[PDB]
Design an enzyme around this catalytic site. Structure first.
Site, short mmCIF file in Angstrom:
data_model
loop_
_atom_site.label_atom_id
_atom_site.label_comp_id
_atom_site.label_asym_id
_atom_site.label_seq_id
_atom_site.Cartn_x
_atom_site.Cartn_y
_atom_site.Cartn_z
N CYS A 34 -0.83 4.37 5.80
CA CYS A 34 -0.81 4.17 7.23
C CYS A 34 0.36 4.87 7.89
O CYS A 34 0.24 5.57 8.88
CB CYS A 34 -0.66 2.64 7.51
SG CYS A 34 -2.27 1.90 7.74
N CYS B 112 -5.72 -1.83 5.33
CA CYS B 112 -6.05 -2.10 6.72
C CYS B 112 -7.27 -1.27 7.12
O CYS B 112 -7.33 -0.53 8.07
CB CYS B 112 -4.86 -1.90 7.63
SG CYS B 112 -4.24 -0.24 7.81
N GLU C 179 0.87 -1.16 0.00
CA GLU C 179 0.00 0.00 0.00
C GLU C 179 0.93 1.24 0.00
O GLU C 179 1.77 1.40 0.83
CB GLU C 179 -0.99 -0.03 1.16
CG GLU C 179 -2.13 0.98 1.16
CD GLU C 179 -1.76 2.44 1.22
OE1 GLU C 179 -2.23 3.34 0.53
OE2 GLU C 179 -0.68 2.60 1.92
N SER D 208 3.32 0.67 10.37
CA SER D 208 4.36 0.90 9.38
C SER D 208 5.21 2.13 9.69
O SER D 208 6.31 2.22 9.15
CB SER D 208 3.72 1.06 8.02
OG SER D 208 3.18 -0.15 7.46
N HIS E 17 -8.35 1.56 11.79
CA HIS E 17 -8.24 2.91 12.30
C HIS E 17 -9.56 3.42 12.90
O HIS E 17 -9.53 4.19 13.85
CB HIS E 17 -7.70 3.93 11.27
CG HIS E 17 -6.28 3.67 10.90
ND1 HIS E 17 -5.24 4.13 11.67
CD2 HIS E 17 -5.73 2.98 9.88
CE1 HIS E 17 -4.10 3.73 11.11
NE2 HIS E 17 -4.36 3.02 9.99
N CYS F 113 -6.24 4.38 5.69
CA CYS F 113 -5.90 3.24 4.89
C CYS F 113 -7.11 2.32 4.65
O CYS F 113 -7.87 1.98 5.58
CB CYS F 113 -4.80 2.48 5.61
SG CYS F 113 -4.19 1.08 4.59
N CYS G 244 2.76 -0.30 4.55
CA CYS G 244 1.59 0.50 4.26
C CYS G 244 1.95 1.97 4.47
O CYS G 244 2.05 2.38 5.62
CB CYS G 244 0.45 0.04 5.15
SG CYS G 244 -1.06 0.91 4.69
N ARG H 239 -0.41 -5.32 10.61
CA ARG H 239 1.00 -4.93 10.49
C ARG H 239 1.64 -4.52 11.82
O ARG H 239 2.81 -4.18 11.83
CB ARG H 239 1.14 -3.82 9.46
CG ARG H 239 0.82 -4.30 8.06
CD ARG H 239 0.44 -3.17 7.07
NE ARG H 239 0.02 -3.86 5.86
CZ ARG H 239 -1.17 -4.44 5.69
NH1 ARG H 239 -2.09 -4.36 6.62
NH2 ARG H 239 -1.46 -5.07 4.56
#
Ligand code: SF4
Ligand code: SF4
Ligand code: F3S
Ligand SMILES: [Mg+2]
Lengths: 267, 534
Positions: free
Chosen positions: B531, B66, B16, B484, B70, B63, B528, B461
């Site tokens: 992210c 994912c 991503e 990330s 969030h 994101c 990502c 992640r």
């Protein structure tokens, strides 16, 4: 990557969360494998292409310069502040990439609210000067078909592409350049709770027995009445949509909704 | 014939977001690395002054890979700030949607993001499908026949002969590549399962929408619980259960066996992309206010000392900007965070990324599946231990093999298998709870004028945290510190390389024009960048 046979698609990622890309992977009848192997030639897509780096850049060049022509599908807003610095790919600003590539497309589709209208990074105070594709590239005569939502129903992208291939033209577009075949009705007029709305039967809170009973979510902020989308009709993932999950519509297919529709739990 | 010189990979695809990786190579091995994130959006700036209830809607758009994570982190954060204790069923439903997210995410990562670093799809055309079927049926309880695989080969053959290779254009394997080791049959098996996973992931994602409205970007969470009364019904539960069961079968019968076959063929990859330090936040709570109530527990490990797991102290996180495109050089605790962009171009003033550099007690920390798995193992987690041991025994390697690109890849599979089983446990508890007559899904709450809150999610992640300061009932500061960011952020003001940067040192590069070895390591972290930067 292309040539004859299947219509070439160049898929670009600007200032985006990749939720629009993921939505396309949810494609149902046709599924994404049919779309990539039979319907279309997906000749550039950073998320899933094999090549990286210089090899990916070469793939993009080859696609864009093909005498067979290409369709551009664009995800994400274009950051324009500070001469486009806030977003680069291969050390080229996104503004520069899109300025060079999109005028060469046979057709451009802006996919998702960010690409269509600027989206989440364009919300106040918009530090990166993010713009939708048609706003940003107005001066180059780019007029993308806008498929709005955050993310849009992938039914609406496939349907628009299929129309285009068949008719060699854009379908009827509304005043926000969205296809009327998908965006012609408000979410609200299609909603199953409309009888409660009409009767003034509103849930006063999420924990309430009225919410349990499926009463209208207007007092809890629902933007269905001011939002144009096909959500209650097509649904998502062949199974649900925000109001049937008990949550108000946040207006996510409308321009500037981050600022227009907020606070999300008020009307 | 070994290359000395720079290599730039920009864009890094099959992640991503927008990542530029820069390395220095000496005699065919990486001697130095930079992780450069090249898109900024500024969601933290945008949130200032808004209604705290609105935060999860904005931050979910950090994101879409994912997705949900969030929204969950923001809602946990504002729940915490507000002091609400959400109902048991809201915790179960939130947990179940998160478990479904992990399955979807890791299956797509292995097949659709990672596998083209290891699978030569075009050599699958060379394969004997009867031989291939034999191999496939030996590694999985699922029987595969020659006809099954010939159907895949026929489809691929038609695709390749049209000369429009699409996503395989200029693939590093085209023409052959010395770092690609699989035989044609194994390439065919992996390619068949890549294709199959394109349709299975539809079902895995649908599982989230059953309770969560839609995927991507769920719309069922609220401060105080969840909104989806329909999730209490037998029908929606049955629908979820059916999708979960099919997804778990794919994990168990297709993904993990393929993971093991590829790992066994690339066992040299136990020697590259190790890291020193690990952080994990735990996930799947019984008690929203106690991380140690989670099925996976939080912990911190330095310098691979898993015999001395340290407790996680949320006050020891600081985010550095000295090598980032932000003002100044001062690291900040996220409750005192700052997001003040200031671009200097690549290595201008020694700055090269839009990611901040999170450090824990000043150290760079890997987060994600390898951290979650190794720390859980080390805490005596019985399911993690049993899967991990089985994987290690099947590969014929020892525990130290896990500290590597292959290890990390394996840990992603281990966690998928363990979570796929645990989803069934949570589902049953959820059912049990309904059966006791608890039908409550949202609790009332009140907005304080002044508060601080934090929400913790262990995302696919790794350790995600959202941090709010409420002032006058509005967002005074909102800071995201994302997995990330930890893993792929740049150097800090002590010049310590981040986990990805450090892991790249030592990477062999056979062909600098086609540096698949760098991708293998970078992809093993499952980056990502939307992210990491937000
Ligand atoms: S429109 Fe929404 S889902 Fe799509 S890229 Fe933008 S923030 Fe993500
Ligand atoms: S829930 Fe929303 S879309 Fe449905 S009737 Fe009420 S206001 Fe309209
Ligand atoms: S939030 Fe968006 S997905 Fe549909 S229900 Fe409202 S337009
Ligand atoms: Mg942050």
């Amino acid at each position: 990557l292309m040539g004859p046979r299947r219509p070439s698609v160049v898929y670009l990622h600007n200032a985006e969360c990749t939720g629009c890309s993921e939505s396309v992977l949810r494609a149902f009848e046709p599924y994404i494998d049919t779309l990539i192997l039979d319907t279309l030639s997906l000749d550039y897509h950073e998320t899933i292409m094999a090549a990286a780096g210089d090899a990916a850049e070469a793939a993009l060049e080859q696609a864009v310069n093909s005498p067979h022509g290409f369709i551009a599908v664009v995800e994400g807003g274009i950051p324009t502040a500070a001469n486009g610095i806030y977003g680069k790919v291969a050390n080229h600003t996104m503004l520069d990439i899109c300025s060079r590539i999109l005028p060469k497309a046979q057709a451009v589709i802006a996919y998702g609210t960010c690409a269509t209208f600027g989206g989440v990074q364009a919300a106040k105070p918009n530090p990166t000067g993010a713009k939708g594709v048609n706003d940003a590239l107005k001066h180059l005569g780019v007029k993308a078909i806008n498929i709005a939502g955050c993310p849009p129903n992938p039914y609406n992208l496939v349907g628009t592409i299929v129309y285009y291939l068949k008719n060699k033209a854009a379908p009827e577009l509304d005043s926000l350049n969205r296809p009327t075949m998908f965006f012609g009705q408000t979410v609200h007029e299609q909603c199953p709770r409309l009888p409660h709305f009409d009767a003034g039967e509103f849930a006063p809170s999420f924990e309430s027995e009225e919410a349990r009973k499926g009463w209208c979510l207007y007092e809890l902020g629902c933007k269905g009445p001011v939002t144009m989308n096909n959500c209650p009709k097509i649904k998502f993932n062949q199974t649900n949509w925000p109001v049937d999950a008990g949550h108000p519509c946040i207006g996510c297919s409308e321009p500037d909704f981050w600022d227009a529709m907020t606070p999300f739990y008020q009307n | 014939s070994s290359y000395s010189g720079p290599i730039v990979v920009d864009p890094v695809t099959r992640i991503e977001g927008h990542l530029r990786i820069e390395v220095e190579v000496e005699n065919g091995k990486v001697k130095n690395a930079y992780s450069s994130s090249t898109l900024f959006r500024g969601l933290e700036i945008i949130l200032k002054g808004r209604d705290p209830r609105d935060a999860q809607h904005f931050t979910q758009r950090t994101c879409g890979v994912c997705t949900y994570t969030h929204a969950l982190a923001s809602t946990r954060c504002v729940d915490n700030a507000v002091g609400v204790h959400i109902p048991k069923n809201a915790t179960y439903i939130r947990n179940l949607v998160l478990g479904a997210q992990y399955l979807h995410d890791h299956i797509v990562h292995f097949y659709h993001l990672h596998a083209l670093d290891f699978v030569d799809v075009t050599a699958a055309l060379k394969a004997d499908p009867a031989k291939a079927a034999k191999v496939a049926s030996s590694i999985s309880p699922r029987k595969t026949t020659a006809a099954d695989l010939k159907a895949v080969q026929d489809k691929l053959k038609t695709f390749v002969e049209t000369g429009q290779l699409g996503p395989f254009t200029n693939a590093y394997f085209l023409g052959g590549h010395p770092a690609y080791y699989l035989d044609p049959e194994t390439n065919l098996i992996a390619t068949a399962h890549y294709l199959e996973a394109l349709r299975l992931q539809v079902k895995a994602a649908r599982a989230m929408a059953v309770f969560g409205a839609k995927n991507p970007h769920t719309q069922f969470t609220v401060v105080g619980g969840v909104t989806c009364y329909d999730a209490l019904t037998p029908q929606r539960i049955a629908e979820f259960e059916a999708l979960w069961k099919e997804t778990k079968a794919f994990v168990d019968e297709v993904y993990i066996p393929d993971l093991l076959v590829v790992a066994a063929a690339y066992k040299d990859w136990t020697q590259y992309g190790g890291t020193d330090n690990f952080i994990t936040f735990g996930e799947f709570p019984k008690d929203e206010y106690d991380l140690n109530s989670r099925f996976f527990k939080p912990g911190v490990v330095f310098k691979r000392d898993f015999k001395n797991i340290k407790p996680f102290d949320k006050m020891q996180i600081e985010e550095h900007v000295r090598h980032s495109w932000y003002e100044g050089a001062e690291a900040r605790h996220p409750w005192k965070g700052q997001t003040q962009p200031k671009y200097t171009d690549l290595h201008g003033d020694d700055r090269y990324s839009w990611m901040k550099a999170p450090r824990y007690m000043g150290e760079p920390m890997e987060t994600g599946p390898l951290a979650q798995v190794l720390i859980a193992y080390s805490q005596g987690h019985p399911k993690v231990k049993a899967v991990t041991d089985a994987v290690l025994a099947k590969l014929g390697v020892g525990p130290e093999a896990l500290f590597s690109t292959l290890g990390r890849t394996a840990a992603r599979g281990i966690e998928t298998a363990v979570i796929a089983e645990y989803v069934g446990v949570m589902l049953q508890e959820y059912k049990d709870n309904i059966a006791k007559g608890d039908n409550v899904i949202c609790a009332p709450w009140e907005m304080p004028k002044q508060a601080e809150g934090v929400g913790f999610v262990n995302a696919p992640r790794g350790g995600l945290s959202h941090w709010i300061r409420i002032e006058d009932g509005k967002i005074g500061n909102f800071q995201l510190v994302v997995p990330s960011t930890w893993t792929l952020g740049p150097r800090c003001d002590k010049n310590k390389l981040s986990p990805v940067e450090a892991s790249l040192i030592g990477t062999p590069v056979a062909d600098a024009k086609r540096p698949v070895e760098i991708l293998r390591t970078v992809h093993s972290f499952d980056p990502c960048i939307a992210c990491g930067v937000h």
